[PDB]
Amino acid sequence: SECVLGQSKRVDFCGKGYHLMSFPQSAPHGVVFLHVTYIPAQEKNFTTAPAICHDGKAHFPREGVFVSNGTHWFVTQRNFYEPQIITTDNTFVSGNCDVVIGIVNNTVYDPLQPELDSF
Amino acid sequence: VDCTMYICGDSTECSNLLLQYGSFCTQLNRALTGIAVEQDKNTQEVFAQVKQIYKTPPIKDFGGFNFSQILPDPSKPSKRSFIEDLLFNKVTDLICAQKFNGLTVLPPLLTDEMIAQYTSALLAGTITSGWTFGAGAALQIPFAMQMAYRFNGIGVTQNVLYENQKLIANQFNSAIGKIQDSLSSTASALGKLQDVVNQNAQALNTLVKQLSSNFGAISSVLNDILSRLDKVEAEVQIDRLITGRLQSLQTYVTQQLIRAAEIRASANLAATKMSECVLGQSKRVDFCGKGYHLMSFPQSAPHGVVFLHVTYIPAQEKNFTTA
Amino acid sequence: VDCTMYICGDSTECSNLLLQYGSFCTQLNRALTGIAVEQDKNTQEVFAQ
Amino acid sequence: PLSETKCTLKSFTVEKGIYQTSNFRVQPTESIVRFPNITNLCPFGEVFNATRFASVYAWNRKRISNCVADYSVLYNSASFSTFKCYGVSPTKLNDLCFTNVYADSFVIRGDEVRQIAPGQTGKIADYNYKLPDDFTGCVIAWNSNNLDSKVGGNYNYLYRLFRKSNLKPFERDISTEIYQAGSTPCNGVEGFNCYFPLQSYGFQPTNGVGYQPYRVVVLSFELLHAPATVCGPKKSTNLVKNKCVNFNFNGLTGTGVLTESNKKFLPFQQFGRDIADTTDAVRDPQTLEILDITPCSFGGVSVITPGTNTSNQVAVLYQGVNCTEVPVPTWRVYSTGSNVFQTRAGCLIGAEHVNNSYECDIPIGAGICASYQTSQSIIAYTMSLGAENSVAYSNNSIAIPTNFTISVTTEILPVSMTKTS
Ligand SMILES: *[C@@H]1O[C@H](CO[C@@H]2O[C@@H](C)[C@@H](O)[C@@H](O)[C@@H]2O)[C@@H](O[C@@H]2O[C@H](CO)[C@@H](O)[C@H](O)[C@H]2NC(C)=O)[C@H](O)[C@H]1NC(C)=O
Ligand SMILES: *[C@@H]1O[C@H](CO)[C@@H](O[C@@H]2O[C@H](CO)[C@@H](O)[C@H](O)[C@H]2NC(C)=O)[C@H](O)[C@H]1NC(C)=O
Ligand SMILES: *[C@@H]1O[C@H](CO)[C@@H](O[C@@H]2O[C@H](CO)[C@@H](O)[C@H](O)[C@H]2NC(C)=O)[C@H](O)[C@H]1NC(C)=O
Ligand SMILES: *[C@@H]1O[C@H](CO)[C@@H](O[C@@H]2O[C@H](CO)[C@@H](O)[C@H](O)[C@H]2NC(C)=O)[C@H](O)[C@H]1NC(C)=O
Ligand SMILES: *[C@@H]1O[C@H](CO)[C@@H](O[C@@H]2O[C@H](CO)[C@@H](O)[C@H](O)[C@H]2NC(C)=O)[C@H](O)[C@H]1NC(C)=O
Ligand SMILES: *[C@@H]1O[C@H](CO)[C@@H](O[C@@H]2O[C@H](CO)[C@@H](O)[C@H](O)[C@H]2NC(C)=O)[C@H](O)[C@H]1NC(C)=O
Ligand SMILES: *[C@@H]1O[C@H](CO)[C@@H](O)[C@H](O)[C@H]1NC(C)=O
Ligand SMILES: *[C@@H]1O[C@H](CO)[C@@H](O)[C@H](O)[C@H]1NC(C)=O
Ligand SMILES: *[C@@H]1O[C@H](CO)[C@@H](O)[C@H](O)[C@H]1NC(C)=O
Ligand SMILES: *[C@@H]1O[C@H](CO)[C@@H](O)[C@H](O)[C@H]1NC(C)=O
Ligand SMILES: *[C@@H]1O[C@H](CO)[C@@H](O)[C@H](O)[C@H]1NC(C)=O
C-alpha cells in the first residue's frame, strides 16, 4: 500500500534513500519489492547563511537555502545544487537584521525595478 | 539449556532412558538457539542502521543547543553518555544455582561499548548532518539551519526559529536537564526494561525449582534413586522424573518462544523509530512523542533503547475572529 | 482458572498429589494473570489517548 | 570436530557457520567414600535367632543404631522363605547408610505373611501390625514349624481377632478389654456378641503350610538429614580436594570438585542445599570439616567452520570454559596451546587471534568474530562496526549534492507458509 500504491515519506521504509516508487514481484511463499530511490551524490561545500540582510530587511528563502561559491551569494534547492539569483520573489522578508544570528549582508534583486527603469 | 544435563544431570542410567523420548532434547536446544540468534538480529537491526561511525567535531558550536548530556563522555572506558550511564545504573539473581544445573547465559554479539558506539554515531550524524546521513552521504549543515528545516516540516516558517533561536536553545537545554533530573530521581521510569529482566529471571528460577519436584517418584534427587533401587525398579522411578522434567523444559521453552515474539515485535518497532524518528522527521502523529516531531536522539540502555523525542508544542493561544 | 480447583475440585486427596508437580499451577495462574492485565493495557493505550 | 558437526547436522556437507555440536564435561578423576568410623557390629543376630518371639498383637521393636551392618550376611543366608524390600533394593542395601533402624519381630500363620506389606488389609494388617503406604524397609519371614509348634498344639502365640477400629501404621495395642460386637454392653464378661479380643493360634506340627507358624522380622530403615548412626561395611577412602572426584558421604553420592568451605555451619548442621535441593556443601563424617560441592565444569562445544565446500579446517569454542580447564567431547587433539585464545564467550581453540578488525563473518560473541582468511587459516578478531568518519561540521558551512544516483534495491518478505494438516 505505502511503497507500491503510493510514495512514502517514511525514512528507510521503502529502501535506502528518498523513495520514488516500488515494484512488486512474486516469489515462492513471499513477495519481492524492488524499491526505486533517489540517492544524492557528488556533494560540494558552500558557505551558508540563515538570512540575507538587505536595506535593513532580513530575507529568508521561500524554499531552498542560501549558499555562496566564495564571492557571490545564491539561493538553491536543498537536495540538488541549482543556484539562482537571490530575488524578492524567491525570498520572503521578516523583521530587521538585528535579531538573526549569523545574518550576512547581500543585495536582493527586485524584478519590477528594471521594468519601470527601462519604461 | 543442555536438555540432557537438566533432566538427567551426571547420570548415564537416566541418559539412556531419555533416548527413548527421541528428538525432544534436540528440539528444545534448537528452539532456544533460534531465540538466542534472534537477540543479536534484534540488536543489529535497531543500532547498526548507521553505515559509518560518525564523530562529532571538537568545536561544538551548535547554535546554543547543548548536547553534553547525550554525547559520549570521553572520561570513561565505557564511553557512554551521561544519560546512558544513568540508564545503565538504573536498570542494572540465583545465577550460580542456575549455572550448576545445566543452564547457561550466552553473551550478546555486540558489547555495550559497541552499542554505545552506534548510538554515538547515530547522534553525531544527526546533529552534524540532519537527516542526510540517513538517505546517503552525511552532508554537514549548521545545527540552527537544520532546526529551521525541522520548523518548516511542522508548518512553522523558518524565521520563527531564527528570531527565537536563543529562546528555543534555552528551552531545549532546560528540557534535557529535566530528563537528567527525572532519570536520576525516579525508579519506575525504566519499568519496560526491568519487566523483561524480571520475566526472564523468574522463568529461570521456576525452571530450577522444578528440579526439586518429585512428579510422583520416591525422591526428587535422581542420584538417590540410583543409589537406593536396582535397575528394574529404578527405571520406573527415573521415568517419572524424566517425564516431569521434560514437561518443565517444554513449558519453559514454549513461553520463551512467546516472549521472543514480544521482544521481536518491540525490536521491529524500535528499528522503525530509529529510521523514522532519528534518521528523519516523522509527520506520523504521536509516533515520535507528543507534539509536532522535530528530531529524536537515541540512547543505549541495558537490553533496550531510549529515544529522546524533541517536539514542538504550541502554547499561549489567543482567540481571533476568522473567515 | 484456579489450577487446583480445575484439576482436583474439592478433593484434598488430589490436592496433596498435585503438590508433587510443584510450580505448574503457579505458572498457569501467573500466565493467565499476565494476559488479563494486558487486556486493560490494550484498552487504555487505544482509548485513553 | 568437523565429523561431529556433520553427524549432528545429519549431513555430509556443512555451510559456513558456528554449530553447537555437543557438551564438554570434566570427568571424575577418582572416587571417594566417607562412611562413619564406627567399628561396632550391629546386633542382628539376637533378633533373628531369638528363642521365643513376641505375639503379633504385641509385636516387639528393637532399635539398631551406632553400629556397622552387613546386610549381605542376611540376604545371602538363604534361610528365609520371603525377603521383600520396599523402596530399597536388597543388593544395594549394603552400600548405604541410615539414620536409625528398627527391627520388629512377631509370629503369624503362613497365610498371613502376605498381609505384612505396605497398603495391606486384614486381621493382621488391620488389628495387629500395620505398615505405612510409603514403607522404606524390608520384610523377612521364614517357616518356624520346627520351633513354634508342638504335638497337641502350641498356644504360646496370640493375635487380636476383634478391634473397635483399624490400627495406624506401626501402632501397638496391648489392651485386653472385651470387644462389644452388638448394641448390648458386655459388663466385662463374655457372652453373645461379647468376645475377648485376643485369640490363640493352634500350631500343630502336622498342620498344612498355610496354617503353620512363620517367624517374621521387619527391618525399618529411615533416611533423613540427621547423621547416619547405621551404615554398611564399605571402608572409607582418603579425602582429596580441588580435583574433580566422585564422592559418597554417608550414602550421599555425587560428583564435584570438593573444596574447603568458608560456610559457617552450626554444630547440628550436616548438609547444605542448592535451589534445586542438590547438596551444595557437606560435613565430613570423620573430621567434621565442611566442604563445598561445586560441580565439575561443563559447557557447550561450538565448532566454527567455513563451508566444507571451502575447507575442512575448523575452530572449536568451549563456551564459558576457561582455557586452563580444557584437557589435552571424545576427541582431545585440538587442545594443544598452539592456537588458544580466551574470549569472553569461552576458550577458543584452533583460531588465530589477529589485531585487525573486519565485518563480522562468523559471530562468536562479546564482540569477537571469526573468518577464514590468509596460507589460509581461521582468524579471530574484534568486529568493525563501520568506517570511521568526521563530518567536517562548521557553523556556516553546508554540503549540497551536485548530482544523484537512481538506486534500485530488493526487499524480500515472507508472506505465507505451506498449508499442512
Ligand atoms: C569540505 O571541506 C572540508 C574542509 O574545509 C575546507 O575549508 C573550507 C573553508 C572550504 O574552503 C572547504 O571547501 C575546504 O575543503 C573537508 O574536510 C576535510 O576532509 C579531509 C579529507 O578529504 C579530512 O582529512 C579533513 O580532516 C577534513 N577537515 C575537517 C575540518 O574535518 C571536506 O572533505 C569537504 N567536503 C567535500 C564534500 O568536499
Ligand atoms: C561565483 O559565481 C559567479 C556567478 O554569479 C561567478 O561570476 C562570473 O564568472 C564568470 C567567469 O567564470 C564571468 O564571465 C561572469 O561575468 C561572472 N559574473 C559576475 C556577476 O561577476 C564567479 O566566478 C563564481 N566564483 C567562484 C569562485 O566560483
Ligand atoms: C551590514 O551593513 C551595515 C551597513 O549597511 C553595517 O552596519 C554598520 O555597522 C557599523 C559597525 O561595524 C556601525 O558603526 C554602523 O553604524 C552600522 N550602520 C548601520 C546603518 O547600522 C553592518 O555592520 C554590516 N554587517 C556585516 C556583517 O558586515
Ligand atoms: C552544557 O551543559 C553542561 C551540563 O551537562 C554544563 O556543565 C555544567 O556547567 C556548570 C558551570 O556552568 C557546572 O557547575 C556543572 O557542574 C556542569 N555540569 C556538568 C555535568 O558538567 C555546561 O556548562 C554546558 N556548556 C555550554 C557550553 O553551555
Ligand atoms: C582462568 O583460570 C586461571 C587459573 O587457572 C586464572 O588465573 C588466575 O587469575 C587470578 C586473578 O583473577 C590470579 O590471582 C591467579 O594467580 C591466577 N592463577 C594462575 C595460575 O595464573 C585466570 O584469571 C582465569 N581467566 C579467566 C578469564 O577466567
Ligand atoms: C552525474 O553523474 C553521472 C553518473 O551517475 C554522470 O554521467 C556520466 O558522465 C560521464 C562523463 O563524465 C560519462 O562518460 C558516463 O557515460 C555518464 N554516465 C551515464 C550513466 O550517463 C554525469 O555526467 C554527472 N553529471 C554532472 C553534472 O556531474
Ligand atoms: C561562527 O563561529 C565564528 C567563530 O569561528 C563566529 O565569529 C561566528 O559569529 C559564528 N557564526 C554563527 C552563525 O554562529
Ligand atoms: C543365627 O545363628 C546362625 C548360627 O547358628 C548364624 O549362622 C546366623 O548368621 C545367625 N543369624 C544372624 C542374623 O546373624
Ligand atoms: C574418626 O576419625 C577421626 C580421625 O580421622 C577422629 O578425629 C574422630 O574422632 C573419629 N570419630 C569419632 C566419632 O571419634
Ligand atoms: C561450492 O563450490 C562450487 C564450485 O566447485 C560452486 O558451484 C557452489 O556454488 C559452491 N557452493 C557453496 C554453498 O559455496
Ligand atoms: C597485537 O597487539 C598486542 C598489544 O596489545 C601485541 O602484544 C601483539 O604482538 C600484537 N599482535 C600482532 C599480530 O600484531
Author numbering:
A (entry chain A): 1030 to 1148
B (entry chain B): 736 to 827, 848 to 1078
C (entry chain C): 736 to 784
D (entry chain A): 295 to 622, 631 to 676, 689 to 735
Wording from the paper:
S glycoprotein trimers protrude out from the viral membrane and are the major proteins on the viral surface, making it the main target for vaccine design. Sequential cleavage of S at the S1/S2 site followed by the S2’ site within the S2 domain exposes the fusion peptide (FP), which mediates host-viral membrane fusion, allowing entry of the viral genome into the host cell. Overall, the S-trimer structures are similar to those previously determined for B.1 in situ, and are similar across all variants.
Early in the pandemic, the S protein obtained an aspartic acid (D) to glycine (G) mutation at position 614 which corresponded with an increase in transmissibility. The most widespread lineage with D614G (lineage B.1) became the dominant genotype globally. The on-virus structure of the B.1 closed state is similar to the one we determined previously from BavPat1 B.1, (the B.1 strain analyzed here differs by an additional V1068I substitution). The significantly higher resolution of the structure we present here allows more reliable determination of side-chain orientations and allows more residues in the 630 loop and FPPR to be resolved. The structure generally agrees with that determined from recombinantly expressed and purified full-length B.1 S trimers. The structural transitions involving residues K854 and F855 were not observed in previous studies using recombinant purified full-length B.1 proteins—instead these residues were found in an α-helix in the closed form and in all chains of the open form in recombinant protein. Of note, B.1 which appeared and became dominant early in the pandemic, and from which all variants tested here are descendants of, removed an interaction between K854 and D614, which may also favor these transitions.
